[PDB]
Ligand binder design. Structure first.
Ligand code: ZN
Length: 37
């Protein structure tokens, strides 16, 4: 969505979606879809 461009909730949010993850690991896990679809 859009909370602050791409940096809303949680210290580890998706800079592509504006998601929110409490773990940097889970961030990368979601961002796996941002590699090559
Ligand atoms: Zn994302």
């Amino acid at each position: 969505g859009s909370t602050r461009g791409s940096t809303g909730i949680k210290p580890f949010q998706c800079p592509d979606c504006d998601r929110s993850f409490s773990r940097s690991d889970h961030l990368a896990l979601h961002r796996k879809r941002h590699m090559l679809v």
